[PDB]
Design a protein around this ligand. Sequence first.
Ligand code: ADP
Ligand code: BIT
Ligand code: VO4
Ligand code: MG
Ligand code: MG
Length: 703
Amino acid sequence: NPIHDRTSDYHKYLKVKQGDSDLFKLTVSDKRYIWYNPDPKERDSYECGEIVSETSDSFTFKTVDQDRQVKKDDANQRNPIKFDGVEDMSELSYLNEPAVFHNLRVRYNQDLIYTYSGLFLVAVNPFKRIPIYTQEMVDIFKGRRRNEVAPHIFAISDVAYRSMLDDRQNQSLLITGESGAGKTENTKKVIQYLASVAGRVLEQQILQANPILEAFGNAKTTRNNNSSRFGKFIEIQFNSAGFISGASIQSYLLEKSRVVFQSETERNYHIFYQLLAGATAEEKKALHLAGPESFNYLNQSGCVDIKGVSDSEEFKITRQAMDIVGFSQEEQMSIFKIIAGILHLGNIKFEKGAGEGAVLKDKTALNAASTVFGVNPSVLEKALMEPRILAGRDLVAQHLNVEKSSSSRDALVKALYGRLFLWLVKKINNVLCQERKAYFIGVLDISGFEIFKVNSFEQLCINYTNEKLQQFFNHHMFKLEQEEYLKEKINWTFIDFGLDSQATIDLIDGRQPPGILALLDEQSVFPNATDNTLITKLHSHFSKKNAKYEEPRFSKTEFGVTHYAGQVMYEIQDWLEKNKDPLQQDLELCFKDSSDNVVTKLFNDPNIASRAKKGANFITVAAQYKEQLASLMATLETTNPHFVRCIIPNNKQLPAKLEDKVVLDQLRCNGVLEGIRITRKGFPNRIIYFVQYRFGITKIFFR
Ligand SMILES: Nc1ncnc2c1ncn2[C@@H]1O[C@H](COP(=O)(O)OP(=O)(O)O)[C@@H](O)[C@H]1O
Ligand SMILES: Cc1ccc2c(c1)C(=O)[C@]1(O)CCN(c3ccccc3)C1=N2
Ligand code: VO4
Ligand SMILES: [Mg+2]
Ligand SMILES: [Mg+2]
């Protein structure tokens, strides 16, 4: 049994190493220690000091260099060192910030990235490979109760699975974290585990969905070389017997804007670089492709390569995945034509004509785009610079200037890419949709909390999703738990754990008074609105009124929201246009006539191409965002949730470098310590009257 065998890989990579005789001596010491700040302005940088004396209300301790004194009520005592490396931190004698961090630190220094914190799992990103995800590791975890085996994403996955069978109830695994923390990697481990333990081709197709979704939906940002720029909820589906019977991917809004613009050091989506690096000799000839430096949508950020990644090798993995899932050869070629066409569209350079209207003097890129898409270039040209619209009921050809022509071309590009993404997902699901499910375990992998030099509408939506997810944790851990105690009169005094995201949520998405998103939508159907009337409207409603909002004095185009994870300043530029997400009808008419079988689906299939109405306007991006979020939250309310809190060690994407201030900020806003305390102070288990404990109006409660 590898669990009891100290030579096994399990012991070597999942268990704390045996301490030596010098450590034992230290472990049986009578000395006592405190965690203190050498500099009181740096409250997250701690050292260990020996307590050398006490009064009834104070401790005196030695610093690393001088004696100091602290009130016992302000003291962060160090746990006895026998607790260092403990698998479940609810066991600590002293529950405080430096002590929790220290325990994570002891584990992380030994490459033990997983630790329990009461009822939920903490996962600290290693930023290197650790050999704990093999089939042999999978086999050790199968069927084991949580307390029987070391902390691992596989263990929580198995717990959910056994709960699904024993309770005949759908489960969810909610993996939180800021950008780069490890959500996507852990998600993939859950799916790997479930597919193995509940498995019977289908299982391979489930796994091979991922390189396809990542190639099209992930990119390098300044926070993560493999950032997910769309959120997803993966339902792994099981029959009544508990075997895997299929899977369904709900994807959420994609950051389409990245197709046409990337900040310094970032990349566009991986697929672009994969194609250009990986394509056949005259694949590149048939698609009129050169290197990335030749394309406006790839040559602006200054970064075309990611350290440690071969885009040519990745392209081969993407294509192998498309084969397994079952995209035909013609389909793959059409997918790649669309990618190449987008790059050509980006190279179109509009210029000022005789008047205010734009012209196209060089039609090389236009012609190359048109060829690969199978559309008529003259029609495309007219649709870009002279689109027809209604003025009342009259049909009037516009003549767009350079900036509008360029923005229209960008709109077409973003629509092509976002529809293609949707089509990939729909094609994947149709293959994985083979049996009506009896049960599901859903795994949620959103885009994580993120802050850049410039934060836009996408960032607000991402960060709001994260705030909502933290609120869901808070609701399940603290609010529902104490509501149960109190309805069942078990002698409980309500505790205010001080984590309530409601104010921030209401600021962003309130209905009365209207929040940010509601005011955005109102401005978006107001004919005279501009980005400046928008920001003026937000300040008018929130400045000096809402405690989570800030009108900054240093800018007239930004506003601040205090999120759980910190304040973010958002730049209002282009919000109205991003929210309305327009595309000229004449561009649609152009592409509806495509000779390509995939392009034509993107423009004629109503599930991909049609856009809902509300009254006389198309649904905004904000309303679409809200529908998707409300849909997720409704599904989650029908599941039994399990939480994994992914923690990023630093902001450099480096191994072996656990940064104090970075980690402690996360432990705090995640509610980790509060979560451990409710587990310790409360009563996790209860049963209708069955035929350190308590008696409810209808149930016995215990621990
Ligand atoms: N458990 C893991 N083992 C090895 N590397 C990991 C692990 N978790 C995260 N990483 C590394 O961190 C990167 C970012 O993690 P990811 O899961 O993509 O973050 P996100 O939370 O933004 O989805 C990964 O590409 C990988 O390099
Ligand atoms: C549940 C949910 C609902 C909407 C979402 C998300 C998740 C995301 O993670 C994103 O898919 C990540 C990017 N994003 C987005 C992109 C552009 C505009 C608005 C939101 C997101 N919207
Ligand atoms: O960088 V992550 O968007 O995948 O949170
Ligand atoms: Mg991710
Ligand atoms: Mg700024």
